[PDB]
Scaffold this active site. Structure first.
Site, PDB file in Angstrom:
ATOM      1  N   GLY A  87       0.774  -1.271   0.045  1.00 38.74           N
ATOM      2  CA  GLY A  87       0.295   0.065   0.012  1.00 38.74           C
ATOM      3  C   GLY A  87       0.960   1.460   0.032  1.00 38.74           C
ATOM      4  O   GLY A  87       1.895   1.318  -0.822  1.00 38.74           O
ATOM      5  N   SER A  88       0.472   2.112   0.888  1.00 39.74           N
ATOM      6  CA  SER A  88       1.090   3.698   0.751  1.00 39.74           C
ATOM      7  C   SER A  88       2.410   3.793   1.004  1.00 39.74           C
ATOM      8  O   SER A  88       3.079   4.642   0.614  1.00 39.74           O
ATOM      9  CB  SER A  88       0.299   4.611   1.668  1.00 39.74           C
ATOM     10  OG  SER A  88      -1.026   4.437   1.510  1.00 39.74           O
ATOM     11  N   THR A  89       3.225   2.631   1.701  1.00 37.77           N
ATOM     12  CA  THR A  89       4.483   2.822   1.988  1.00 37.77           C
ATOM     13  C   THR A  89       5.263   2.583   0.743  1.00 37.77           C
ATOM     14  O   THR A  89       6.473   2.814   0.814  1.00 37.77           O
ATOM     15  CB  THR A  89       4.917   1.376   2.921  1.00 37.77           C
ATOM     16  OG1 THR A  89       4.721   0.188   2.276  1.00 37.77           O
ATOM     17  CG2 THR A  89       4.344   1.646   4.305  1.00 37.77           C
TER      18      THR A  89
END
Length: 497
Positions: A247-249
Protein backbone atom coordinates in the site's frame (compact mmCIF):
# COMPACT_ATOMS: atom_id res chain seq x y z
CA UNK A 1 31.08 -68.31 9.12
CA UNK A 2 31.73 -64.53 9.19
CA UNK A 3 35.37 -63.39 9.65
CA UNK A 4 36.86 -63.65 13.19
CA UNK A 5 38.21 -60.07 12.71
CA UNK A 6 37.13 -57.07 10.59
CA UNK A 7 38.53 -53.47 10.43
CA UNK A 8 35.47 -51.13 10.62
CA UNK A 9 35.12 -47.31 10.84
CA UNK A 10 33.12 -45.06 13.20
CA UNK A 11 32.37 -41.37 12.40
CA UNK A 12 33.79 -38.72 14.81
CA UNK A 13 31.06 -35.99 15.10
CA UNK A 14 32.43 -32.42 14.54
CA UNK A 15 31.82 -29.38 16.84
CA UNK A 16 29.45 -26.96 15.07
CA UNK A 17 30.75 -23.37 14.63
CA UNK A 18 29.96 -20.62 17.20
CA UNK A 19 27.34 -18.10 16.08
CA UNK A 20 27.82 -14.62 17.63
CA UNK A 21 26.12 -11.24 17.24
CA UNK A 22 28.11 -8.54 15.58
CA UNK A 23 29.85 -7.59 18.92
CA UNK A 24 30.88 -11.28 19.63
CA UNK A 25 28.00 -12.06 22.05
CA UNK A 26 27.31 -15.79 21.70
CA UNK A 27 23.97 -16.75 20.09
CA UNK A 28 24.50 -20.47 19.33
CA UNK A 29 27.06 -22.61 21.15
CA UNK A 30 27.88 -26.36 20.73
CA UNK A 31 27.42 -28.19 24.13
CA UNK A 32 29.17 -31.62 24.52
CA UNK A 33 26.71 -34.55 24.96
CA UNK A 34 27.16 -38.34 25.08
CA UNK A 35 25.37 -40.83 22.73
CA UNK A 36 25.26 -44.50 23.80
CA UNK A 37 24.96 -47.32 21.26
CA UNK A 38 24.86 -51.10 21.91
CA UNK A 39 25.74 -54.42 20.30
CA UNK A 40 22.57 -56.45 21.20
CA UNK A 41 24.58 -59.76 20.83
CA UNK A 42 26.77 -58.61 23.82
CA UNK A 43 23.83 -57.00 25.71
CA UNK A 44 21.88 -60.33 25.40
CA UNK A 45 24.63 -61.97 27.67
CA UNK A 46 24.07 -59.41 30.55
CA UNK A 47 20.23 -59.34 31.02
CA UNK A 48 20.43 -58.91 34.84
CA UNK A 49 22.06 -55.44 34.23
CA UNK A 50 19.23 -54.22 31.97
CA UNK A 51 16.94 -52.55 34.56
CA UNK A 52 19.81 -50.49 36.05
CA UNK A 53 20.91 -49.51 32.51
CA UNK A 54 17.30 -48.62 31.47
CA UNK A 55 16.79 -46.41 34.66
CA UNK A 56 20.14 -44.58 33.95
CA UNK A 57 18.83 -43.93 30.33
CA UNK A 58 15.45 -42.79 31.78
CA UNK A 59 13.73 -45.61 29.84
CA UNK A 60 10.96 -48.02 30.96
CA UNK A 61 12.33 -51.44 32.12
CA UNK A 62 10.09 -53.60 29.88
CA UNK A 63 10.13 -51.30 26.81
CA UNK A 64 13.97 -51.34 27.03
CA UNK A 65 14.05 -55.18 27.36
CA UNK A 66 11.54 -55.56 24.43
CA UNK A 67 13.78 -53.29 22.24
CA UNK A 68 17.03 -55.31 22.89
CA UNK A 69 15.18 -58.68 22.51
CA UNK A 70 13.57 -57.49 19.21
CA UNK A 71 17.10 -56.48 17.95
CA UNK A 72 18.99 -59.55 19.35
CA UNK A 73 20.39 -60.44 15.85
CA UNK A 74 21.82 -56.90 15.15
CA UNK A 75 25.33 -55.71 16.13
CA UNK A 76 24.35 -51.95 16.36
CA UNK A 77 21.42 -49.95 17.80
CA UNK A 78 21.39 -46.53 19.47
CA UNK A 79 20.39 -46.69 23.14
CA UNK A 80 20.10 -42.92 23.71
CA UNK A 81 21.22 -39.63 22.08
CA UNK A 82 22.47 -36.54 23.93
CA UNK A 83 22.96 -37.40 27.62
CA UNK A 84 25.10 -34.93 29.67
CA UNK A 85 28.79 -36.02 29.74
CA UNK A 86 28.27 -36.63 33.53
CA UNK A 87 25.21 -38.87 32.74
CA UNK A 88 27.15 -40.80 30.01
CA UNK A 89 30.14 -41.37 32.38
CA UNK A 90 27.56 -42.78 34.88
CA UNK A 91 26.27 -45.34 32.29
CA UNK A 92 29.83 -46.19 31.12
CA UNK A 93 30.75 -46.71 34.81
CA UNK A 94 28.10 -49.52 34.96
CA UNK A 95 30.41 -51.62 32.63
CA UNK A 96 27.41 -53.32 30.91
CA UNK A 97 28.72 -55.66 28.16
CA UNK A 98 27.94 -54.26 24.69
CA UNK A 99 27.43 -50.54 25.67
CA UNK A 100 29.65 -48.00 23.77
CA UNK A 101 29.81 -44.15 23.80
CA UNK A 102 30.17 -41.50 21.06
CA UNK A 103 30.91 -37.80 21.84
CA UNK A 104 28.23 -35.62 20.04
CA UNK A 105 27.21 -31.93 20.29
CA UNK A 106 23.87 -30.21 21.08
CA UNK A 107 23.28 -26.49 20.56
CA UNK A 108 22.43 -24.01 23.31
CA UNK A 109 20.95 -20.56 22.39
CA UNK A 110 21.90 -18.13 25.19
CA UNK A 111 19.47 -15.42 24.05
CA UNK A 112 16.58 -17.91 23.48
CA UNK A 113 13.30 -16.47 22.22
CA UNK A 114 14.79 -12.95 21.70
CA UNK A 115 16.55 -14.02 18.45
CA UNK A 116 14.77 -17.37 17.80
CA UNK A 117 13.87 -16.91 14.11
CA UNK A 118 17.07 -15.16 12.91
CA UNK A 119 19.42 -17.72 14.55
CA UNK A 120 17.11 -20.76 14.08
CA UNK A 121 17.91 -24.19 15.59
CA UNK A 122 19.34 -27.62 14.80
CA UNK A 123 17.69 -31.09 14.55
CA UNK A 124 18.55 -34.36 16.45
CA UNK A 125 21.64 -34.75 14.09
CA UNK A 126 22.89 -31.19 14.96
CA UNK A 127 22.01 -29.97 11.43
CA UNK A 128 20.37 -26.62 10.69
CA UNK A 129 16.53 -26.72 10.46
CA UNK A 130 15.66 -22.94 10.58
CA UNK A 131 17.23 -19.47 10.27
CA UNK A 132 21.03 -18.93 10.11
CA UNK A 133 21.57 -22.45 11.32
CA UNK A 134 19.87 -23.66 8.05
CA UNK A 135 21.16 -20.90 5.71
CA UNK A 136 24.82 -21.41 6.86
CA UNK A 137 24.54 -25.18 7.65
CA UNK A 138 27.49 -26.16 5.42
CA UNK A 139 29.72 -23.36 6.89
CA UNK A 140 28.71 -24.15 10.53
CA UNK A 141 28.63 -27.99 10.29
CA UNK A 142 32.31 -28.72 9.58
CA UNK A 143 33.32 -32.29 8.61
CA UNK A 144 33.00 -35.48 10.68
CA UNK A 145 36.30 -37.30 11.38
CA UNK A 146 36.88 -41.06 11.03
CA UNK A 147 38.49 -43.76 13.16
CA UNK A 148 39.11 -47.52 12.64
CA UNK A 149 38.02 -50.18 15.14
CA UNK A 150 38.58 -53.93 15.03
CA UNK A 151 35.38 -56.03 15.49
CA UNK A 152 35.11 -59.79 16.06
CA UNK A 153 32.62 -62.27 14.42
CA UNK A 154 29.73 -61.18 16.78
CA UNK A 155 30.44 -57.42 16.37
CA UNK A 156 32.35 -56.82 19.66
CA UNK A 157 34.75 -53.84 19.48
CA UNK A 158 38.05 -55.55 20.54
CA UNK A 159 40.46 -52.64 19.72
CA UNK A 160 40.43 -48.88 18.97
CA UNK A 161 43.01 -48.88 16.08
CA UNK A 162 43.58 -45.25 15.03
CA UNK A 163 42.04 -41.96 13.88
CA UNK A 164 42.23 -42.00 10.01
CA UNK A 165 40.52 -38.54 9.56
CA UNK A 166 40.61 -35.73 12.22
CA UNK A 167 37.15 -34.08 12.64
CA UNK A 168 37.18 -30.54 11.09
CA UNK A 169 35.27 -28.19 13.49
CA UNK A 170 32.64 -25.97 11.82
CA UNK A 171 33.46 -22.32 11.12
CA UNK A 172 32.46 -19.37 13.40
CA UNK A 173 29.90 -16.89 12.14
CA UNK A 174 29.31 -13.30 13.32
CA UNK A 175 25.83 -12.08 12.48
CA UNK A 176 24.97 -8.51 11.48
CA UNK A 177 22.45 -8.59 14.36
CA UNK A 178 23.23 -6.32 17.33
CA UNK A 179 21.69 -8.08 20.30
CA UNK A 180 21.17 -4.75 22.12
CA UNK A 181 18.90 -3.54 19.28
CA UNK A 182 17.36 -7.02 18.95
CA UNK A 183 16.32 -7.03 22.66
CA UNK A 184 14.81 -3.50 22.27
CA UNK A 185 12.96 -4.53 19.05
CA UNK A 186 11.69 -7.80 20.56
CA UNK A 187 10.47 -6.06 23.79
CA UNK A 188 8.68 -3.20 22.04
CA UNK A 189 7.03 -5.37 19.32
CA UNK A 190 5.84 -7.90 21.96
CA UNK A 191 4.53 -5.08 24.26
CA UNK A 192 2.70 -3.35 21.32
CA UNK A 193 0.97 -6.61 20.28
CA UNK A 194 -0.09 -7.47 23.89
CA UNK A 195 -1.35 -3.92 24.53
CA UNK A 196 -3.36 -3.78 21.24
CA UNK A 197 -4.85 -7.31 21.27
CA UNK A 198 -2.80 -8.35 18.20
CA UNK A 199 -1.31 -11.87 17.73
CA UNK A 200 1.54 -11.46 15.21
CA UNK A 201 3.94 -9.02 13.65
CA UNK A 202 7.56 -8.34 12.69
CA UNK A 203 10.20 -5.62 13.03
CA UNK A 204 13.32 -5.20 10.89
CA UNK A 205 16.16 -2.74 11.54
CA UNK A 206 18.80 -2.17 8.88
CA UNK A 207 22.02 -0.16 8.64
CA UNK A 208 21.35 1.94 5.53
CA UNK A 209 25.13 2.38 4.82
CA UNK A 210 26.20 -1.28 5.12
CA UNK A 211 23.12 -3.43 4.17
CA UNK A 212 23.37 -5.10 7.59
CA UNK A 213 20.24 -6.43 9.27
CA UNK A 214 20.79 -5.08 12.82
CA UNK A 215 17.53 -6.59 14.25
CA UNK A 216 14.93 -9.02 12.93
CA UNK A 217 12.17 -10.00 15.37
CA UNK A 218 8.81 -11.80 14.80
CA UNK A 219 5.87 -12.47 17.15
CA UNK A 220 4.92 -15.00 18.11
CA UNK A 221 8.29 -16.47 19.02
CA UNK A 222 9.49 -19.51 20.85
CA UNK A 223 12.30 -20.80 23.07
CA UNK A 224 14.64 -22.78 20.74
CA UNK A 225 16.15 -24.48 23.88
CA UNK A 226 12.73 -26.01 24.81
CA UNK A 227 10.55 -26.71 21.75
CA UNK A 228 8.44 -29.39 23.59
CA UNK A 229 5.09 -27.48 23.02
CA UNK A 230 6.23 -25.52 19.89
CA UNK A 231 3.31 -24.22 17.69
CA UNK A 232 3.84 -23.81 13.88
CA UNK A 233 2.50 -20.17 14.05
CA UNK A 234 5.48 -19.48 16.42
CA UNK A 235 8.20 -20.98 14.16
CA UNK A 236 7.25 -18.75 11.14
CA UNK A 237 10.04 -16.21 10.24
CA UNK A 238 7.34 -13.67 9.26
CA UNK A 239 9.84 -10.89 8.27
CA UNK A 240 11.19 -13.20 5.47
CA UNK A 241 8.03 -15.28 4.67
CA UNK A 242 4.85 -13.16 5.03
CA UNK A 243 3.99 -11.50 1.65
CA UNK A 244 1.67 -8.52 1.47
CA UNK A 245 0.62 -5.65 -0.79
CA UNK A 246 2.54 -2.74 0.82
CA UNK A 247 0.00 0.00 0.00
CA UNK A 248 1.01 3.58 0.79
CA UNK A 249 4.54 2.59 2.00
CA UNK A 250 5.72 2.36 -1.67
CA UNK A 251 4.23 5.74 -2.72
CA UNK A 252 7.70 7.26 -1.97
CA UNK A 253 9.08 5.11 -4.89
CA UNK A 254 6.24 6.36 -7.14
CA UNK A 255 7.24 9.93 -6.09
CA UNK A 256 10.96 9.12 -6.81
CA UNK A 257 10.00 8.10 -10.38
CA UNK A 258 7.94 11.33 -10.73
CA UNK A 259 10.90 13.56 -9.59
CA UNK A 260 13.33 11.64 -11.96
CA UNK A 261 10.93 12.07 -14.95
CA UNK A 262 11.74 15.77 -15.54
CA UNK A 263 7.96 16.46 -15.35
CA UNK A 264 7.44 17.07 -11.59
CA UNK A 265 8.89 19.25 -8.79
CA UNK A 266 7.89 19.17 -5.07
CA UNK A 267 5.96 22.47 -5.23
CA UNK A 268 3.74 21.04 -8.05
CA UNK A 269 0.02 20.85 -7.24
CA UNK A 270 -2.46 18.08 -8.12
CA UNK A 271 -6.20 18.55 -7.77
CA UNK A 272 -7.58 15.41 -6.08
CA UNK A 273 -11.16 16.73 -5.53
CA UNK A 274 -13.56 15.01 -4.87
CA UNK A 275 -11.34 12.22 -3.51
CA UNK A 276 -12.31 9.88 -6.41
CA UNK A 277 -11.18 9.49 -10.03
CA UNK A 278 -13.14 7.56 -12.62
CA UNK A 279 -10.92 5.56 -15.03
CA UNK A 280 -13.41 3.79 -17.35
CA UNK A 281 -15.41 1.19 -15.36
CA UNK A 282 -12.97 1.59 -12.36
CA UNK A 283 -13.09 4.28 -9.59
CA UNK A 284 -9.94 5.19 -7.65
CA UNK A 285 -11.11 6.26 -4.17
CA UNK A 286 -9.06 8.06 -1.50
CA UNK A 287 -9.13 7.09 2.18
CA UNK A 288 -9.50 10.81 3.13
CA UNK A 289 -11.73 12.85 0.75
CA UNK A 290 -11.40 16.38 2.25
CA UNK A 291 -8.90 17.84 -0.29
CA UNK A 292 -8.73 19.77 -3.54
CA UNK A 293 -5.22 21.08 -4.30
CA UNK A 294 -2.32 19.16 -2.67
CA UNK A 295 1.38 19.70 -3.34
CA UNK A 296 3.53 16.56 -3.80
CA UNK A 297 4.32 16.45 -0.05
CA UNK A 298 0.59 16.73 0.78
CA UNK A 299 -0.19 13.80 -1.62
CA UNK A 300 2.15 11.68 0.62
CA UNK A 301 0.79 13.20 3.97
CA UNK A 302 -2.86 12.47 2.94
CA UNK A 303 -1.85 9.20 1.17
CA UNK A 304 -4.08 10.27 -1.76
CA UNK A 305 -4.50 7.41 -4.27
CA UNK A 306 -6.04 9.93 -6.68
CA UNK A 307 -2.98 12.24 -6.34
CA UNK A 308 -0.38 9.51 -6.93
CA UNK A 309 -2.48 7.96 -9.76
CA UNK A 310 -2.66 11.29 -11.68
CA UNK A 311 1.16 11.59 -11.35
CA UNK A 312 1.57 7.92 -12.49
CA UNK A 313 -0.61 8.47 -15.61
CA UNK A 314 1.59 11.52 -16.50
CA UNK A 315 5.00 9.73 -16.07
CA UNK A 316 3.89 6.16 -17.13
CA UNK A 317 3.93 2.97 -15.05
CA UNK A 318 7.26 1.77 -16.55
CA UNK A 319 9.18 4.56 -14.66
CA UNK A 320 7.60 3.45 -11.35
CA UNK A 321 8.09 -0.30 -12.12
CA UNK A 322 11.81 0.41 -12.79
CA UNK A 323 12.38 2.25 -9.43
CA UNK A 324 10.52 -0.42 -7.44
CA UNK A 325 12.50 -3.21 -9.25
CA UNK A 326 15.84 -1.43 -8.66
CA UNK A 327 15.23 -0.89 -4.85
CA UNK A 328 14.53 -4.69 -4.62
CA UNK A 329 10.68 -4.85 -4.20
CA UNK A 330 9.50 -8.25 -5.47
CA UNK A 331 13.20 -9.32 -5.99
CA UNK A 332 15.49 -12.05 -4.61
CA UNK A 333 17.27 -10.67 -1.49
CA UNK A 334 20.30 -12.91 -2.13
CA UNK A 335 20.28 -13.90 1.59
CA UNK A 336 20.06 -17.65 0.68
CA UNK A 337 17.55 -18.50 3.41
CA UNK A 338 15.75 -21.53 1.87
CA UNK A 339 12.01 -20.75 1.69
CA UNK A 340 12.47 -16.94 1.83
CA UNK A 341 9.58 -15.48 -0.23
CA UNK A 342 10.29 -13.13 -3.19
CA UNK A 343 6.72 -11.81 -3.63
CA UNK A 344 5.75 -10.39 -7.05
CA UNK A 345 6.36 -7.14 -8.94
CA UNK A 346 4.14 -7.69 -11.99
CA UNK A 347 5.32 -6.33 -15.34
CA UNK A 348 3.45 -5.36 -18.55
CA UNK A 349 4.29 -4.19 -22.08
CA UNK A 350 1.10 -2.04 -22.12
CA UNK A 351 0.02 -0.71 -18.67
CA UNK A 352 -3.70 0.11 -18.57
CA UNK A 353 -4.73 2.94 -16.22
CA UNK A 354 -6.14 0.54 -13.55
CA UNK A 355 -2.85 -1.44 -13.30
CA UNK A 356 -0.77 1.79 -13.44
CA UNK A 357 -2.78 3.27 -10.52
CA UNK A 358 -2.70 0.05 -8.31
CA UNK A 359 1.12 -0.19 -8.82
CA UNK A 360 1.63 3.48 -7.86
CA UNK A 361 -0.41 3.24 -4.62
CA UNK A 362 1.03 -0.17 -3.63
CA UNK A 363 -1.77 -2.73 -4.26
CA UNK A 364 -0.22 -3.92 -7.62
CA UNK A 365 2.74 -5.75 -6.06
CA UNK A 366 3.53 -7.99 -3.08
CA UNK A 367 6.64 -7.79 -0.92
CA UNK A 368 8.09 -8.98 2.37
CA UNK A 369 9.07 -6.78 5.38
CA UNK A 370 12.79 -7.50 4.55
CA UNK A 371 12.32 -6.21 0.97
CA UNK A 372 10.42 -3.13 2.18
CA UNK A 373 13.18 -2.29 4.76
CA UNK A 374 15.83 -2.86 1.97
CA UNK A 375 13.97 -0.39 -0.33
CA UNK A 376 13.76 2.19 2.53
CA UNK A 377 17.49 1.68 3.16
CA UNK A 378 18.29 2.55 -0.48
CA UNK A 379 16.18 5.73 -0.28
CA UNK A 380 17.75 6.61 3.12
CA UNK A 381 21.31 5.92 1.84
CA UNK A 382 20.92 8.90 -0.58
CA UNK A 383 19.55 6.49 -3.24
CA UNK A 384 22.37 3.93 -3.17
CA UNK A 385 21.28 0.29 -2.73
CA UNK A 386 23.65 -1.98 -0.76
CA UNK A 387 23.18 -5.78 -0.74
CA UNK A 388 21.37 -7.20 2.30
CA UNK A 389 23.54 -9.00 4.82
CA UNK A 390 22.70 -11.17 7.84
CA UNK A 391 26.47 -11.41 8.61
CA UNK A 392 28.82 -8.69 9.95
CA UNK A 393 30.03 -6.42 7.10
CA UNK A 394 33.61 -5.10 7.43
CA UNK A 395 34.17 -3.99 3.78
CA UNK A 396 30.99 -2.24 2.57
CA UNK A 397 30.07 -3.27 -1.03
CA UNK A 398 30.01 -0.50 -3.66
CA UNK A 399 26.29 -1.02 -4.25
CA UNK A 400 24.28 0.70 -6.99
CA UNK A 401 23.03 4.24 -7.36
CA UNK A 402 19.35 3.36 -8.04
CA UNK A 403 17.82 6.84 -7.19
CA UNK A 404 19.78 10.04 -7.88
CA UNK A 405 21.19 11.62 -4.69
CA UNK A 406 19.21 14.81 -5.37
CA UNK A 407 15.86 12.92 -5.80
CA UNK A 408 16.56 10.74 -2.79
CA UNK A 409 17.31 13.85 -0.67
CA UNK A 410 14.06 15.55 -1.85
CA UNK A 411 12.01 12.41 -1.03
CA UNK A 412 13.76 12.14 2.45
CA UNK A 413 12.59 15.71 3.13
CA UNK A 414 9.00 14.87 2.01
CA UNK A 415 8.95 11.85 4.36
CA UNK A 416 10.31 14.08 7.18
CA UNK A 417 7.25 16.28 6.63
CA UNK A 418 4.94 13.18 6.62
CA UNK A 419 6.15 12.58 10.23
CA UNK A 420 6.61 16.25 11.37
CA UNK A 421 4.10 18.42 9.47
CA UNK A 422 0.65 19.40 10.93
CA UNK A 423 -1.75 16.56 9.82
CA UNK A 424 1.18 14.12 9.64
CA UNK A 425 1.96 10.76 11.42
CA UNK A 426 2.98 12.56 14.68
CA UNK A 427 3.03 9.16 16.60
CA UNK A 428 6.11 8.18 14.48
CA UNK A 429 8.05 11.30 15.79
CA UNK A 430 11.41 10.60 17.57
CA UNK A 431 12.17 13.29 20.20
CA UNK A 432 15.68 14.89 19.64
CA UNK A 433 15.93 13.76 15.98
CA UNK A 434 14.30 14.35 12.57
CA UNK A 435 12.56 11.03 11.66
CA UNK A 436 11.06 10.31 8.20
CA UNK A 437 8.67 7.60 6.97
CA UNK A 438 5.25 6.52 5.84
CA UNK A 439 2.44 4.40 7.31
CA UNK A 440 0.43 1.93 5.24
CA UNK A 441 -2.49 -0.46 5.38
CA UNK A 442 -1.07 -3.66 3.87
CA UNK A 443 -3.29 -6.47 2.44
CA UNK A 444 -1.98 -10.12 2.98
CA UNK A 445 -1.26 -12.32 -0.12
CA UNK A 446 -1.37 -16.14 0.57
CA UNK A 447 -8.30 -10.36 2.70
CA UNK A 448 -6.12 -10.07 5.89
CA UNK A 449 -4.67 -6.63 6.82
CA UNK A 450 -1.40 -5.45 8.38
CA UNK A 451 -0.51 -2.04 9.88
CA UNK A 452 2.82 -0.98 8.41
CA UNK A 453 5.24 1.77 9.27
CA UNK A 454 8.40 2.16 7.17
CA UNK A 455 10.98 4.88 7.82
CA UNK A 456 14.48 6.04 8.69
CA UNK A 457 16.42 8.41 10.95
CA UNK A 458 18.03 10.85 11.42
CA UNK A 459 15.82 12.37 8.65
CA UNK A 460 18.47 14.82 7.35
CA UNK A 461 21.42 12.32 7.53
CA UNK A 462 19.98 8.75 7.69
CA UNK A 463 21.66 5.85 9.56
CA UNK A 464 18.87 3.32 10.31
CA UNK A 465 15.85 2.12 8.30
CA UNK A 466 13.04 0.26 10.05
CA UNK A 467 9.84 -1.59 9.08
CA UNK A 468 7.14 -2.40 11.67
CA UNK A 469 4.40 -4.93 10.69
CA UNK A 470 1.40 -5.44 13.04
CA UNK A 471 -1.11 -8.10 11.85
CA UNK A 472 -4.68 -6.85 12.73
CA UNK A 473 -5.36 2.95 10.53
CA UNK A 474 -2.64 5.65 10.14
CA UNK A 475 0.11 3.59 11.93
CA UNK A 476 -1.82 4.13 15.21
CA UNK A 477 -0.18 0.88 16.50
CA UNK A 478 2.90 0.48 14.16
CA UNK A 479 3.99 4.18 14.23
CA UNK A 480 4.55 4.29 18.09
CA UNK A 481 6.64 1.07 17.90
CA UNK A 482 8.81 2.75 15.20
CA UNK A 483 9.10 5.80 17.51
CA UNK A 484 10.17 3.83 20.61
CA UNK A 485 12.54 1.39 18.83
CA UNK A 486 14.16 4.11 16.68
CA UNK A 487 14.66 6.40 19.79
CA UNK A 488 16.52 3.55 21.48
CA UNK A 489 18.42 2.15 18.42
CA UNK A 490 19.83 5.55 17.49
CA UNK A 491 21.19 6.16 21.02
CA UNK A 492 22.57 2.58 21.32
CA UNK A 493 24.51 3.39 18.11
CA UNK A 494 25.64 6.80 19.55
CA UNK A 495 23.99 8.60 16.62
CA UNK A 496 24.07 12.38 17.29
CA UNK A 497 20.78 14.38 17.19
Amino acid sequence: QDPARSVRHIAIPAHRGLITDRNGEPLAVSTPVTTLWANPKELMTAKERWPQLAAALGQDTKLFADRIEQNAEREFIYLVRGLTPEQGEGVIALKVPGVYSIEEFRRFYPAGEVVAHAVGFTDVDDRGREGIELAFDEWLAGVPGKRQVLKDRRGRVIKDVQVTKNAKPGKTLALSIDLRLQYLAHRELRNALLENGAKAGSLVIMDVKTGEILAMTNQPTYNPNNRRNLQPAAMRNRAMIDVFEPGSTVKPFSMSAALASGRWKPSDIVDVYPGTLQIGRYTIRDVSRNSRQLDLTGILIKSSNVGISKIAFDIGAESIYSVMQQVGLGQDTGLGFPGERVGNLPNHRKWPKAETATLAYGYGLSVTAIQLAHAYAALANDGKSVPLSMTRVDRVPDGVQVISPEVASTVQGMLQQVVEAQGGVFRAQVPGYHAAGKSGTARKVSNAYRSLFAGFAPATDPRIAMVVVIDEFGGLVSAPVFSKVMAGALRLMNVPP
